[PDB]
Design an enzyme around this catalytic site. Structure first.
Site, PDB file in Angstrom:
ATOM      1  N   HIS A 195       0.835  -1.201   0.000  1.00  0.00           N
ATOM      2  CA  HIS A 195       0.000   0.000   0.000  1.00  0.00           C
ATOM      3  C   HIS A 195       0.869   1.249   0.000  1.00  0.00           C
ATOM      4  CE1 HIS A 195      -2.251  -3.327   1.757  1.00  0.00           C
ATOM      5  NE2 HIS A 195      -3.362  -2.741   1.345  1.00  0.00           N
TER       6      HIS A 195
ATOM      7  N   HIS B  24      -4.135   3.303  -3.455  1.00  0.00           N
ATOM      8  CA  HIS B  24      -4.359   2.805  -2.098  1.00  0.00           C
ATOM      9  C   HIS B  24      -3.583   1.517  -1.824  1.00  0.00           C
ATOM     10  CE1 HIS B  24      -6.310   0.877   1.337  1.00  0.00           C
ATOM     11  NE2 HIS B  24      -6.423  -0.169   0.539  1.00  0.00           N
TER      12      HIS B  24
ATOM     13  N   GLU C  21     -18.313  -3.449  24.248  1.00  0.00           N
ATOM     14  CA  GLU C  21     -17.518  -4.672  24.419  1.00  0.00           C
ATOM     15  C   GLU C  21     -16.277  -4.685  23.526  1.00  0.00           C
ATOM     16  OE1 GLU C  21     -20.760  -4.725  23.537  1.00  0.00           O
ATOM     17  OE2 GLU C  21     -21.695  -5.203  25.465  1.00  0.00           O
TER      18      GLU C  21
ATOM     19  N   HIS D 157     -29.367 -14.253  24.399  1.00  0.00           N
ATOM     20  CA  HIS D 157     -28.378 -14.135  25.458  1.00  0.00           C
ATOM     21  C   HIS D 157     -27.689 -15.448  25.796  1.00  0.00           C
ATOM     22  CE1 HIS D 157     -29.994 -10.162  26.026  1.00  0.00           C
ATOM     23  NE2 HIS D 157     -29.406  -9.968  27.194  1.00  0.00           N
TER      24      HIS D 157
ATOM     25  N   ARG E 136     -24.025 -18.434  35.769  1.00  0.00           N
ATOM     26  CA  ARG E 136     -24.989 -17.685  36.574  1.00  0.00           C
ATOM     27  C   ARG E 136     -25.327 -18.424  37.865  1.00  0.00           C
ATOM     28  NH1 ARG E 136     -29.698 -19.827  37.149  1.00  0.00           N
ATOM     29  NH2 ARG E 136     -29.740 -19.243  39.365  1.00  0.00           N
TER      30      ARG E 136
HETATM   31  C1  LIG Z   1     -11.758  -1.575   3.642  1.00  0.00           C
HETATM   32  C2  LIG Z   1     -10.185  -1.564   3.793  1.00  0.00           C
HETATM   33  C3  LIG Z   1      -9.577  -0.394   3.739  1.00  0.00           C
HETATM   34  C4  LIG Z   1     -10.258   0.993   3.685  1.00  0.00           C
HETATM   35  C5  LIG Z   1      -9.134   1.804   3.528  1.00  0.00           C
HETATM   36  O1  LIG Z   1      -9.611   3.166   3.425  1.00  0.00           O
HETATM   37  P1  LIG Z   1      -8.772   4.191   4.380  1.00  0.00           P
HETATM   38  O2  LIG Z   1      -9.417   5.509   4.281  1.00  0.00           O
HETATM   39  O3  LIG Z   1      -8.628   3.808   5.884  1.00  0.00           O
HETATM   40  O4  LIG Z   1      -7.374   4.190   3.829  1.00  0.00           O
HETATM   41  P2  LIG Z   1      -6.457   4.940   2.656  1.00  0.00           P
HETATM   42  O5  LIG Z   1      -6.918   6.320   2.550  1.00  0.00           O
HETATM   43  O6  LIG Z   1      -5.209   4.713   2.995  1.00  0.00           O
HETATM   44  O7  LIG Z   1      -7.013   4.156   1.413  1.00  0.00           O
HETATM   45  S1  LIG Z   1      -7.840  -0.754   4.118  1.00  0.00           S
HETATM   46  C6  LIG Z   1      -8.096  -2.607   4.025  1.00  0.00           C
HETATM   47  C7  LIG Z   1      -7.125  -3.509   4.055  1.00  0.00           C
HETATM   48  O8  LIG Z   1      -7.386  -4.801   3.991  1.00  0.00           O
HETATM   49  C8  LIG Z   1      -5.830  -3.511   4.206  1.00  0.00           C
HETATM   50  O9  LIG Z   1      -5.571  -3.487   5.806  1.00  0.00           O
HETATM   51  N1  LIG Z   1      -9.520  -2.759   4.006  1.00  0.00           N
HETATM   52  C9  LIG Z   1     -10.274  -3.870   4.408  1.00  0.00           C
HETATM   53  C10 LIG Z   1     -10.556  -3.895   5.909  1.00  0.00           C
HETATM   54  C11 LIG Z   1     -11.924  -3.989   6.198  1.00  0.00           C
HETATM   55  N2  LIG Z   1     -12.371  -4.023   7.476  1.00  0.00           N
HETATM   56  C12 LIG Z   1     -11.411  -3.980   8.505  1.00  0.00           C
HETATM   57  C13 LIG Z   1     -11.997  -4.025   9.937  1.00  0.00           C
HETATM   58  N3  LIG Z   1     -10.211  -3.901   8.219  1.00  0.00           N
HETATM   59  C14 LIG Z   1      -9.579  -3.800   7.006  1.00  0.00           C
HETATM   60  N4  LIG Z   1      -8.348  -3.774   6.899  1.00  0.00           N
HETATM   61  C1  LIG Z   2     -25.636  -3.638  29.442  1.00  0.00           C
HETATM   62  C2  LIG Z   2     -26.959  -4.148  29.225  1.00  0.00           C
HETATM   63  C3  LIG Z   2     -27.881  -3.284  29.365  1.00  0.00           C
HETATM   64  C4  LIG Z   2     -28.069  -1.829  29.873  1.00  0.00           C
HETATM   65  C5  LIG Z   2     -28.588  -1.247  28.913  1.00  0.00           C
HETATM   66  O1  LIG Z   2     -28.846   0.141  29.781  1.00  0.00           O
HETATM   67  P1  LIG Z   2     -29.974   0.954  28.789  1.00  0.00           P
HETATM   68  O2  LIG Z   2     -29.792   2.449  29.009  1.00  0.00           O
HETATM   69  O3  LIG Z   2     -30.064   0.551  27.473  1.00  0.00           O
HETATM   70  O4  LIG Z   2     -31.394   0.585  29.324  1.00  0.00           O
HETATM   71  P2  LIG Z   2     -32.387   1.086  30.530  1.00  0.00           P
HETATM   72  O5  LIG Z   2     -32.395   2.542  30.706  1.00  0.00           O
HETATM   73  O6  LIG Z   2     -33.508   0.602  30.139  1.00  0.00           O
HETATM   74  O7  LIG Z   2     -31.441   0.686  31.875  1.00  0.00           O
HETATM   75  S1  LIG Z   2     -29.506  -3.975  29.011  1.00  0.00           S
HETATM   76  C6  LIG Z   2     -28.672  -5.641  29.093  1.00  0.00           C
HETATM   77  C7  LIG Z   2     -29.346  -6.907  28.952  1.00  0.00           C
HETATM   78  O8  LIG Z   2     -28.807  -7.982  28.824  1.00  0.00           O
HETATM   79  C8  LIG Z   2     -30.767  -7.132  28.787  1.00  0.00           C
HETATM   80  O9  LIG Z   2     -31.033  -7.237  27.308  1.00  0.00           O
HETATM   81  N1  LIG Z   2     -27.229  -5.468  28.968  1.00  0.00           N
HETATM   82  C9  LIG Z   2     -26.175  -6.293  28.645  1.00  0.00           C
HETATM   83  C10 LIG Z   2     -25.960  -6.213  27.119  1.00  0.00           C
HETATM   84  C11 LIG Z   2     -24.617  -5.886  26.748  1.00  0.00           C
HETATM   85  N2  LIG Z   2     -24.315  -5.802  25.337  1.00  0.00           N
HETATM   86  C12 LIG Z   2     -25.308  -6.012  24.491  1.00  0.00           C
HETATM   87  C13 LIG Z   2     -24.610  -5.896  23.182  1.00  0.00           C
HETATM   88  N3  LIG Z   2     -26.485  -6.292  24.767  1.00  0.00           N
HETATM   89  C14 LIG Z   2     -26.907  -6.376  26.039  1.00  0.00           C
HETATM   90  N4  LIG Z   2     -28.240  -6.685  26.084  1.00  0.00           N
END
Ligand SMILES: CC1=C(CCOP(=O)(O)OP(=O)(O)O)S/C(=C(/O)CO)N1Cc1cnc(C)nc1N
Ligand SMILES: CC1=C(CCOP(=O)(O)OP(=O)(O)O)S/C(=C(/O)CO)N1Cc1cnc(C)nc1N
Ligand SMILES: [Mg+2]
Ligand SMILES: [Mg+2]
Lengths: 663, 663
Positions: free
Chosen positions: A26, A261, A411, A473, A520
Site C-alpha cells: 500500500h 491505495h 464490548e 443471550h 450464573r
Molecule cells: C476496507 C479496507 C480499507 C479501507 C481503507 O480506506 P482508508 O481511508 O482507511 O485508507 P487509505 O486512505 O489509505 O485508502 S484498508 C483494508 C485492508 O485490507 C488492508 O488493511 N480494508 C479492508 C478492511 C476492512 N475491514 C477492517 C476491519 N479492516 C480492514 N483492513
Molecule cells: C448492558 C446491558 C444493558 C443496559 C442497557 O442500559 P440501557 O440504558 O439501554 O437501558 P435502561 O435505561 O432501560 O437501563 S440492558 C442488558 C441486557 O442484557 C438485557 O437485554 N445489557 C447487557 C448487554 C450488553 N451488550 C449487548 C450488546 N447487549 C446487552 N443486552
C-alpha cells in the site's frame, strides 16, 4: 542541507520502492502522510531508537496499518535496529517487515494493526495506562511518568463502530495526552468516500468532548507543527487533528485516486514520481546527510539518560514505589504470589461452597487484588452481574490513581482498549461481559491472542443456565469458537476451586490471554485428592475412576460436571466400570505431553460421553466417532433454567441412557 | 373517560405485574417510555392488528429489547392476537411472550432484539427497504409504498459502536421516514451513566446529518406529539427525538434508579406504585373503556382496506409490476429460476475455467441478476476485491430505485442492516467483506440465523492463499465458527461450478442465511459426471473413487480439493484404493439421508485424511480419532501465498505422507 519536504520524501521513496520490489502493498497512505510523520517524529516524538522498551517513551500507533511502509521507513531512518535489507524483504517470509506491522516482529512497533479501528482503540488504552500510572506513581517533584500517545488513522477507522466506542470513552476520561491525526484524503477502496461517508467528523468528535483542529494542510510542515503545539497545550481533552492530505502525494497519475491505495505504483509511474518530487536517489539509497537529519540516537540517548537520572532520584526518595514501578513495567509477578494463591486454592478445596463460578471469580479477585496492585479491571456496564468489583476497586473516573474502568456498553472497544493497556506495560488488565456479547468483541479477543498479550477475560452467564433472558443471550457455540482460536486459553471451571485455579493460570500466563467461562447458577464443589487438586492446572484430569479399563469415560466441563458425576454414580451402583474426566481447559490439556493425555483418555477406550451445555460438534475431537455427546444442537429458549436443562436433555436419566447405548 | 396518562398507565401496570408474576424481567424501561408509546401508537402508527403482515404497515422496532413488556402491552392493548393469558406467561416455556421479543413468536413483533444496537440497525435496514421499494414500484398517481419506520432505543444502543455505523449511513442516505426515540433516562446497569457516557448525543447525530429534537419532556403527551409532528414534516433527514424520561416512572422508591432496570419491583413497591399512579385495577385487569380507547382493529382494518383498493387500481394500470410486488413481498422465487440456474450450472461444468471462486461468485451474480430484481446487495468498501458488482448494479446513493449499497467500512452495521432488509420483505440482500472481518459482524450473522432470515453472505480471501497481507487478514478459524452456528449454511466451493451451486442454494434458502467462503486465487475446475454434478448440492460427494471399498478417503474443501486430488493420483498409481470426497457444505451434507452419507463416508473406513487451509480441530467430526488432518493449527504469516502453502504443509508430499501413516 535538506529541506523538511526532502526529508519527508525519503519516506515516500522507501515506501513506493519497497512496495514495488514486493509487488504487493500500500503506497498511498505512506505517501499521503509523510509530511505529517516528518513533523511528528523529528520535532515532537520522545523516543530512543537504542532502547525501544524505555518505560517513559512516547507511544506511536499506526491505526491505518496497511500503510506499514510508513512506520518501517520511520524506524529505519531514525536509527532503530531495522536495516535496509529488511525493507528490501518487505512482505517476505520471516522478515521484520510484514505487510501489516506486528508487535514483537520489529524494533519499535508498539502494536499489531491491520484490522481497521483497533489501532485507535489500542492508543486509547495506552493513554489510559499512562494517565493511571502517572496518578499512581508520580510524587511531588518526581514526575517519572509523563509521555504522550500519538495515533494516525484514516477514513476506514473513522467509519468503524469501534472508533465511536473508544473515542467517546476517551472524551469522558479527558485523555489530554492522546493526540490523533486523521488522514482526511477523501478516498477509500470503493472510491470517493462521499458516496458512503458524509459525517461532519469534526462535529462528531466535539460531541465526544475532543479538542478538534480543522482544515490542517497535511502537506505544509509549518501548519502541522502549529497544530501539534496547540494539541499539546490543551491538557484536559484528547485532540483530533484533521489533516487534509492527497493519497499517493507525488504520483502525477495516481495521486488522489483509489488506484494508489493498495497496489504497486508501477515502475514507469515511480520514475515520474521521482521527477515530480525531485528525489534523485536510487531505490533503497539514502545519503549520509539525510540520515544525519533523521537520526534520533543522540537525542534519544540524551532524553533517556535524563529520565534515568530522574528515576534514580525517585528511587532514593520513594524506594518501595520505585521497586513496584520496575516490577510492574517488566510484567513480573510478586515473589510471594504463587505461594499465597496456592494457599487460597487449598483453602477452597478444604472448605466447600456451592456458589456460582461468577461468584467464585469475584472471590478470587478479592483474594488476588491485595497482591496484584497492577490490576486494571472493568466490565462493559455489567459490574453487578459479572461481579467484577472487589472491596479495593476504585473507578478511575472517580480517582485517576484507581484500578477499575466503567467501560459502558462497549464490548469491542473495551477489549481493544485492554490490548492497549497490556501493550503499554505496568498493568494486568481484566475485562468482562456476558459470554454472548464476546461476539461483539470477537476480533479484539483474536488480536490479544495474536499479539501474545496477558489479559484475563471474565465472561459470565455461560449457557442456558442463565434462564429467562432467552436465546439472544444464551451462549451455545461461543466457547467452541474460543477453543479453536490459536494461542487462546479458555477455562470453564466446574466449581469454586477450578475457578481459582483458572484465575491463577490467567494472571500468570505471560504470553497470551485467558478467558474464564463462568456460570450464573450455583455449582457443586467436587472432592479432590492432593494429586487431583494439582492436576486441575493440566486442563483435563481424572476426577472419578474405576479399577481396570473403564467401560465408559464421561468428559464434562463447567456446570455439567455435577451431572456427569451423578450419572457415573448411578452406573457405578449398577456395576458398570466408569470414569469421569473434568476438562476445564481443552487448550491446557492439549499442551500436556502424550503420556499424560493417554493416562486421562486412553486410546483403548472408545466409549466416551461428552457432557456440556454448548454446541455438540466441538466434542468429536475428544469423543471420536464411536461415542456420544450430550450437548446443544440448537439455539436456546426463554424459560426458567431448570426447565431448560430438562427440555434440552441435561438430566441424569438422559445422560445414563445415552451412555448405556455404548455398552 | 380515561386520560392519556391513564391510558399510558395501563402499559405500566401490565409491565410491572407481568414482570412480578414471572419473578424475572425489566420493568424500568417500559414504565419510562409508556407515555411516548401511547402517543406514537394511538396518534401516529399505521398498522392493522388483524393482519400483522400488511405490506404497507409502519414498522416499529424496540431496540432496547429488554423492555419487552412494553411491546407485549402495546400489542395486547391494541388488539393483536396476544391474549392476557400470554402476558401472564411472560418468560415461561413456549409462551408467546419471551423475555426478549422474537420475530415469528408473537404477532406484530418485527424483529428479534436483546443484543443492544442491532434493533436500530434493523430499523435503518427497514427504512432503506421502504425507500428503495417505493422508488422501484411507485408510479404517478399510484404510491403503493409509503410507510414510516419508528424505533425506540436507550443509552446502551447509543454507546454501542454499531449505532455509529448505521446512523452515519442513515444520514448519508437521507432516510426521512426513519424516526428514532432516544430514552434519555440517565441510567444504565452500572448506575448513573455520567461516569462512562458523556456524549453530546444531539450534536453527534447532527454530525450524521440527522434532524434532532432536543429536550422533549417524555412524560408530557403534548410535548411528545409536537415532536413527532415535527419529525414527520422533515422529509429529507432521519429524525432523533431526545426524550427525557424517568426510568421506572411511578415507583416512589425505584424510579430514577438502576434498581428498576432489570428486576421485579416487589409486591410492596408495586402497591405503592399503584397508589402513586392512581391505578385502581388488579393485576391483569383492564377495564373495557381502556380497551375501547386503545383498540386499533377498526381503524387498522379501514386503513388496510383503503390500501387494498389502492393496490387493486395499481394492478389494473401496472399488472406486471403488481405481480412482481406480490411475489417479492411474499419472498417467492421466480417460477423458472430453478431451471435457468441449473442450465447455468451445467454450462459451467461443460466449459471449464480456472478462476478464483470470488470471480465465480461475481459470475453467478451476473447470471442471476436479471432473474432476481429483488437483489439488494453491497460490500463494506470492498467492491473491487469481493467482486460484488455486476453489469446491472446501480448504487442507491445515485439512484433510489437501484439495487446496490456502498456500505462503507461498517461490517457489523452492514450485516444487521441487511437483517432489517430481509425482515421488511421485498428484497433478497447480499453482503460482503473479507472473511476475516466477519468477526466484526459476528453477532449479526448469528442473529440472521436465529431469526431464520434469507441473506447471502459473500466472504472472500478465505485463507493463507491471500498471501502477503499476513496473519491479521488470513482466516484460520472463522469457517469452523460458521459451521457450528445453528441454522447457518456454509459453502466453500472448490471451482466455478461448486460456486454457482452454492449461490443457487443460498438464494433458494427460505429459512436462514448462507455464507460463501471464496478464494483470492485461481482454482482449477474438476471433471464431473452428471451424477456428481447433481450431487454438489448435497454438500459432500464422491469426486474421485476406486473399485470396491476404499482403503483411504481424502476429505477436502475449496482451494485444497486440487491438492487432495493430486495426492489421490499418487496413491492410486501406487495401487492404493483411494477416494476423494469434496465437501463444499458440511451442513448440506449432514442433512442428507444416512444411506447417502454412508455411500460417501462409509463407517467401516477409518483411514480418513481431511485437507483444508483452516483450523484442524473442526475436522475430527468427520475423521474421528484414527485419521489425519492436514490443516492449520497456528496463525498465518506475511509472505507470498505459494510459499505459505509450502511452509504450512499444503504440499503433495506432506498429504501423501500423512495418508501413508494410516495404511
Ligand atoms: C476496507 C479496507 C480499507 C479501507 C481503507 O480506506 P482508508 O481511508 O482507511 O485508507 P487509505 O486512505 O489509505 O485508502 S484498508 C483494508 C485492508 O485490507 C488492508 O488493511 N480494508 C479492508 C478492511 C476492512 N475491514 C477492517 C476491519 N479492516 C480492514 N483492513
Ligand atoms: C448492558 C446491558 C444493558 C443496559 C442497557 O442500559 P440501557 O440504558 O439501554 O437501558 P435502561 O435505561 O432501560 O437501563 S440492558 C442488558 C441486557 O442484557 C438485557 O437485554 N445489557 C447487557 C448487554 C450488553 N451488550 C449487548 C450488546 N447487549 C446487552 N443486552
Ligand atoms: Mg482514506
Ligand atoms: Mg438508560
Amino acid at each position: 542541507m535538506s529541506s523538511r519536504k526532502e526529508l519527508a520524501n525519503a519516506i515516500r521513496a522507501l515506501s513506493m520502492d519497497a512496495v514495488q520490489k514486493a509487488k504487493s502493498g500500500h503506497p498511498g497512505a505512506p505517501m499521503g502522510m509523510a509530511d505529517i510523520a516528518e513533523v511528528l517524529w523529528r520535532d515532537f516524538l520522545k523516543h530512543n531508537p537504542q532502547n525501544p522498551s524505555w518505560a517513559d517513551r512516547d507511544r506511536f500507533v499506526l491505526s491505518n496499518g496497511h500503510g506499514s511502509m510508513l512506520i518501517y521507513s520511520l524506524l529505519h531512518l531514525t536509527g532503530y535496529d531495522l536495516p535496509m535489507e529488511e525493507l528490501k524483504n518487505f512482505r517476505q517470509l520471516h522478515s521484520k517487515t510484514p505487510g501489516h506491522p506486528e508487535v514483537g516482529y520489529t524494533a519499535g512497533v508498539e502494536t499489531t494493526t491491520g484490522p481497521l479501528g483497533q489501532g485507535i482503540a489500542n492508543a486509547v488504552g495506552m493513554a489510559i495506562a499512562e494517565k493511571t500510572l502517572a496518578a499512581q506513581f508520580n510524587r511531588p517533584g518526581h514526575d517519572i511518568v509523563d509521555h504522550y500517545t500519538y495515533a494516525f488513522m484514516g477514513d476506514g477507522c473513522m467509519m468503524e463502530g469501534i472508533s465511536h466506542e473508544v473515542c467517546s470513552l476517551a472524551g469522558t476520561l479527558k485523555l489530554g495526552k492522546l493526540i490523533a491525526f486523521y488522514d482526511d484524503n477523501g478516498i477509500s477502496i470503493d472510491g470517493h468516500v462521499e458516496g458512503w461517508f458524509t459525517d461532519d467528523t469534526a462535529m462528531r468528535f466535539e460531541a465526544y468532548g475532543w479538542h478538534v483542529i480543522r482544515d490542517i494542510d497535511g502537506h505544509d510542515a509549518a501548519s502541522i507543527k502549529r497544530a501539534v503545539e496547540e494539541a499539546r497545550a490543551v491538557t484536559d481533552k484528547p485532540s483530533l487533528l484533521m489533516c487534509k492530505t492527497i493519497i499517493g502525494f507525488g504520483s502525477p497519475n495516481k495521486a488522489g485516486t483509489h488506484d494508489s491505495h493498495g497496489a504497486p505504483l508501477g515502475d514507469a509511474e515511480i520514475a515520474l514520481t521521482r521527477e515530480q518530487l525531485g528525489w534523485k536517489y536510487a531505490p533503497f539509497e539514502i545519503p549520509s546527510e539525510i540520515y544525519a537529519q533523521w537520526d534520533a540516537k543522540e537525542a534519544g540517548q540524551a532524553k533517556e539518560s535524563a529520565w534515568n537520572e530522574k528515576f534514580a532520584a525517585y528511587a532514593k526518595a520513594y524506594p518501595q514505589e520505585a521497586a513496584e514501578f520496575t516490577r510492574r513495567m517488566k510484567g513480573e509477578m510478586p515473589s510471594d504470589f504463587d505461594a499465597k494463591a496456592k494457599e487460597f486454592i487449598a483453602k477452597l478445596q478444604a472448605n466447600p461452597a456451592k456458589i456460582a463460578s461468577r461468584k467464585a471469580s469475584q472471590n478470587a479477585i478479592e483474594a488476588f487484588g491485595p497482591l496484584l496492585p497492577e490490576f486494571l479491571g472493568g466490565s462493559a456496564d455489567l459490574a453487578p452481574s459479572n461481579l467484577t468489583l472487589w472491596s479495593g476497586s476504585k473507578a478511575i473516573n472517580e480517582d485517576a490513581a484507581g484500578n477499575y474502568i466503567h467501560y459502558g456498553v462497549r464490548e469491542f472497544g473495551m477489549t481493544a482498549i485492554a490490548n492497549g493497556i497490556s501493550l503499554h506495560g505496568g498493568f494486568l488488565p481484566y475485562t468482562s461481559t456476558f459470554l454472548m456479547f464476546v461476539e461483539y468483541a470477537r476480533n479484539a479477543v483474536r488480536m490479544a491472542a495474536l499479539m501474545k498479550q496477558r489479559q484475563v477475560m471474565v465472561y459470565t452467564h455461560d449457557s442456558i443456565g442463565l434462564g429467562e433472558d432467552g436465546p439472544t443471550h444464551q451462549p451455545v457455540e461461543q466457547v467452541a469458537s474460543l477453543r479453536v482460536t490459536p494461542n487462546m486459553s479458555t477455562w470453564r471451571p466446574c466449581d469454586q476451586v477450578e475457578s481459582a485455579v483458572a484465575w491463577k493460570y490467567g494472571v500468570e500466563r505471560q504470553d497470551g490471554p485467558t478467558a474464564l467461562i463462568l456460570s450464573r447458577q450455583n455449582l457443586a464443589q467436587q472432592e479432590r485428592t492432593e494429586e487431583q487438586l494439582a492436576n486441575i492446572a493440566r486442563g483435563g484430569y481424572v476426577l472419578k475412576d474405576c479399577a481396570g479399563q473403564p467401560e465408559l469415560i464421561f468428559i464434562a466441563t463447567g456446570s455439567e460436571v455435577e451431572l456427569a458425576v451423578a450419572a457415573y454414580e448411578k452406573l457405578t451402583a449398577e456395576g458398570v466400570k466408569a470414569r469421569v474426566v473434568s476438562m476445564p481447559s481443552t487448550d491446557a490439556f492439549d499442551k500436556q505431553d502424550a503420556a499424560y493425555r493417554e493416562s486421562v483418555l486412553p486410546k483403548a477406550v472408545t466409549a466416551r460421553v461428552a457432557v456440556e451445555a454448548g454446541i455438540a460438534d466441538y466434542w468429536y475431537k475428544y469423543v471420536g466417532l464411536n461415542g456420544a455427546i450430550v450437548g446443544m444442537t440448537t439455539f436456546g429458549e426463554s424459560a426458567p433454567a431448570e426447565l431448560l436443562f430438562e427440555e434440552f436433555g441435561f438430566t441424569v436419566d438422559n445422560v445414563v441412557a445415552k451412555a448405556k447405548e455404548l455398552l
